[PDB]
């Protein structure tokens, strides 16, 4: 009934935004900054 509707709505809000949050986190300069992993330019 309405419970399945709310289940679908709750699973539609979160999954795409979580995937895009991960994509944004690693696309910008956040993954390198937080985890200490060096970017390829700085390598000597």
């Amino acid at each position: 009934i309405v419970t399945s509707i709310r289940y679908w709505v709750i699973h539609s809000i979160t999954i795409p935004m979580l995937f895009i949050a991960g994509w944004l986190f690693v696309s910008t300069g956040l993954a390198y900054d937080a985890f200490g992993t060096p970017r390829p330019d700085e390598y000597f």
Binding site: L18, F19, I20, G22, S27, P40
Partner: peptide
């Protein structure tokens, strides 16, 4: 409970797979 037993694994996995998907493009 089952709710946590599933979500504790589900909620980071999508984040991580999206991360790896983007890394599959960030490579020059």
């Amino acid at each position: 409970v089952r709710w946590l037993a599933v979500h504790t694994l589900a909620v980071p996995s999508v984040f991580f797979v999206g991360a790896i998907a983007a890394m599959q493009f960030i490579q020059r």
